[PDB]
Structure 1
Amino acid sequence: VKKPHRYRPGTVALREIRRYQKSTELLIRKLPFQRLVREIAQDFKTDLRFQSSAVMALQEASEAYLVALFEDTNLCAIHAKRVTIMPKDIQLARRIRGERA
């Protein structure tokens, strides 16, 4: 007899888009990314140490690359008359960029 205030799907998504394009703080949590970086590095040399600045630089580079990739992915998804990005969109973006063979 009242109904809660549910925003129509796609509204909070746009609000989040605005919020996260307005800000600059890193979006990936720091500890999980550091653990991932160390695990990946473990396959090239054992008993490696990382300067905190090194992990931060890796995180910034990775986040910037992923954001640019998602921009290209959204462009491809819109090109297909879609609104949802799908793995095929990421694959096409990477293929055109020249990253994926």
Structure 2
Amino acid sequence: LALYEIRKYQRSTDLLISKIPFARLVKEVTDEFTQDLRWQSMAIMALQEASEAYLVGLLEHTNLLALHAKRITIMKKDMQLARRIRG
């Protein structure tokens, strides 16, 4: 059952990652950088969408990097050289 989840999560054009643990994470990083700040939920789902787009871009860049080095399972070095062509 390899092609089942690829045709399921891609066609369903909604989100997949969590919201309230991501709210706890953004509260953690604002405790790291700032003083508590109130956060609009539209801003939290915008950060969620931007993180999702950045992650799917990084994984679709490492997809061909896996098959380039005669591999299928991606490695830790694949998330060390895909950043070189991402800044």
Write the distance in 2 (CA, Å) between the matches of 1:43 and 1:30: 20
Q: Distance in 1 between matches of 2:58 and 2:39?
A: 26
Give the number of the structure with larger relative contact order, counting CA–CA contacts within 8 Å between residues 6 or more apart. Answer: 2
Q: Kindly provide the CA deviation profile for residues 26-66 of structure 1, in whole angstroms up to 9, marking residues without a partner as x.
A: 11111111111111111222111100111010000001110
User: What runs of 5+ residues in structure 2 fail to find an aligned partner?
Assistant: none
Say if 2:32 is the partner of 1:46: no
Verify the 8 A CA contact 2:62 2:82 in the aligned structure 1. Answer: yes
Match of 1:89 in 2: 78
What is the aligned length?
A: 87
> What TM-score results when the alignment is normalised by the length of structure 2?
0.89
Residue pair 1:74, 1:85 contacting (<8 A) in 2 also? yes
Equivalent pair of 2:63/2:74 in contact (CA under 8 Å):
yes
Unmatched 5+ stretches in structure 1: 1-10
TM-score, scaled to structure 1: 0.78
Q: Runs of at least 4 residues of structure 1 off by over 2 A?
A: none
